[PDB]
């Protein structure tokens, strides 16, 4: 699965506000380049990064409208100059 | 959310075998016509349909290759001849040969 196919999924998640929550699990892990990862979280606000034993979990958010943000979390690890994505999660949340 | 957008998401799930599981929750519910629904499950094998008090849960599967299948389940309810989808789940499952 190339980053381009992932971008097609992201278009659907971002562009349809009725998607309250979506969870994606990959097996094998999806491989993307350093640039694609920075492109992936382009214009997002980095929230938390947790260096786990086996993988890193990072959270980001994009403002959508009003006080509603699209939150994004992924588990991944780094090897031989590539990012291996275990899973992705998006949820629309209202900030207090 | 238009049926084309839903169809766009399915094309990705179908064409990328690395997608082991996908869970989608809608709020508000996504409304599709009965024709769109049948088009959605065009070549799938119906596996189960459960009519509960508040919504229907229907499950389908498509054979992919060998003993590997793509399972699809959704919760929906019917009003004025239209289908309101609450949630969808997809998962790739291996149906193993069993019992000695």
């Amino acid at each position: 699965m190339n980053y381009k196919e992932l971008e097609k999924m992201l278009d659907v998640i971002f562009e349809n506000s009725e998607i309250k929550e979506i969870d994606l699990f990959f097996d094998p892990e999806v491989e993307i380049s350093k640039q694609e990862f920075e492109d992936l979280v382009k214009n997002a606000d980095p929230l938390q990064k947790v260096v786990g034993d086996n993988y890193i979990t990072e959270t980001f958010e994009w403002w959508e409208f009003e006080n509603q943000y699209l939150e994004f979390e992924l588990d991944y690890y780094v090897k031989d100059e590539k990012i291996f994505v275990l899973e992705m999660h998006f949820w629309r949340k209202i900030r207090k």
Side-chain angles (χ1 to χ4, degrees), chain A:
Chain A
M1 194 183 167
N2 59 20
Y3 181 68
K4 295 184 74 66
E5 283 290 286
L6 202 49
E7 280 182 320
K8 281 186 199 303
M9 180 73 68
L10 286 310
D11 288 341
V12 176
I13 298 166
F14 279 58
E15 291 170 15
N16 296 284
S17 306
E18 304 94 340
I19 297 169
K20 181 69 180 174
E21 180 180 346
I22 178 164
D23 302 302
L24 301 91
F25 300 86
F26 302 112
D27 185 14
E29 299 86 37
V30 169
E31 292 178 2
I32 62 169
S33 73
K34 34 49 171 228
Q35 203 54 37
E36 295 168 326
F37 187 29
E38 284 184 327
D39 280 332
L40 172 62
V41 297
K42 194 78 79 180
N43 306 319
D45 287 327
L47 297 179
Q48 188 167 19
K49 170 171 166 183
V50 183
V51 179
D53 299 357
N54 286 115
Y55 51 81
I56 301 156
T57 305
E58 281 205 73
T59 63
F60 310 83
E61 73 180 357
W62 292 261
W63 176 72
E64 186 177 25
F65 56 61
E66 302 183 339
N67 54 2
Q68 177 164 303
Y69 297 73
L70 179 64
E71 190 158 338
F72 170 51
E73 177 179 302
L74 78 171
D75 292 351
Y76 68 89
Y77 65 84
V78 213
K79 234 183 55 128
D80 298 325
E81 289 168 282
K82 246 117 213 73
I83 297 92
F84 292 76
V85 179
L86 295 233
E87 53 189 78
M88 287 166 57
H89 308 275
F90 298 84
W91 59 104
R92 294 179 148 79
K93 169 185 178 295
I94 286 89
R95 290 213 328 226
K96 334 226 158 310

